[PDB]
Write a protein that binds this ligand. Structure first.
Ligand code: HEM
Ligand code: HEM
Lengths: 137, 137
């Protein structure tokens, strides 16, 4: 449950990502793989231009989720099935990705990525992660 | 157990912090308080110049720990007693601080804070946190 101010804040973060999905997503994956090498097993194909492609897909889906905070479970249902049932992504990986995403955004946006924006963004992404992991057995 | 390359990497990170302990530490606390408001209960006195003072103390201790990775338990013993026994800081707060610290460093250092440096820094700070929490009952 995001407040109106929090929804405005995550829209502001997204406006700073739009157009950079591939580059920011590739850097997110690189940071995740280096700081948490256990995550590399999920991406044997990516383990450099293929990084840009997957990064683009991933962050484009994040942008779509911003437009659907009120019905995230319905809108993300295919992606939830994919991560929980088909890919079998251990839910513990999702906080590692979210923390890594904050670092990449801070590196590019510096003080434009304010602590208020980070709090809202973290709440939003934690909710996305719940949807993408709750079907995991 | 940090490798020689990892020790070189954390020395490089510290060289980029030195002189900015107060400012970076204050921003670390502000980010921690905003993204994780549950942490504010530990700092009723700080909850703005007092932020600079505490930030300075905290990050100066980090710098001292860099010089003592081989005998962290002995060198940090007073600080371990303080956090675990006197302040009773719940160990779950330490990952929140470490993640917040990466974000603050990225915001200021941008791509100079490389993913290799972050991996080494994270390993180092996770070890500091183990020392500062293992006495907690
Ligand atoms: C907010 C969190 C996440 C979002 C929005 C997201 C989004 C996506 C999307 C849209 C795809 C489709 C790629 C395609 O069909 O080409 C995908 C695939 C994939 N995701 Fe995620 N993902 C997230 C978290 C994770 C995490 C934490 C992991 C593992 C650590 C992961 C591992 C994978 C893998 C292995 C694939 C398949 C890649 C491929 O087949 O090329 N994802 N993800
Ligand atoms: C790498 C991790 C940490 C380091 C190196 C560190 C370092 C320090 C130092 C050097 C002091 C002494 C301040 C003084 O005597 O004036 C201190 C005090 C304190 N620390 Fe930490 N700290 C760490 C983590 C934490 C965390 C995670 C919390 C709580 C969320 C915390 C809460 C406190 C509090 C409440 C004080 C007392 C402040 C005061 O009395 O003014 N510390 N810390």
């Amino acid at each position: 449950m995001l407040s109106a101010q929090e929804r405005a804040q995550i829209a502001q973060v997204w406006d700073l990502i739009a157009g950079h999905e591939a580059q920011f997503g590739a850097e997110l994956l690189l940071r995740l793989f280096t700081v948490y090498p256990s995550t590399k097993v999920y991406f044997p194909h990516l383990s450099a231009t293929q990084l840009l492609s997957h990064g683009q897909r991933m962050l484009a889906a994040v942008g779509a989720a911003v437009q659907h905070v009120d019905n995230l479970r319905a809108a993300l249902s295919p992606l939830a099935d994919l991560h929980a049932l088909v890919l079998r992504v251990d839910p513990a990986n999702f906080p590692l990705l979210i923390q890594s995403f904050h670092v990449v955004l801070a590196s590019h946006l510096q003080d434009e990525f304010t602590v208020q924006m980070q709090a809202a963004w973290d709440k939003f992404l934690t909710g996305v992660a719940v949807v993408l992991t709750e079907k995991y057995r």
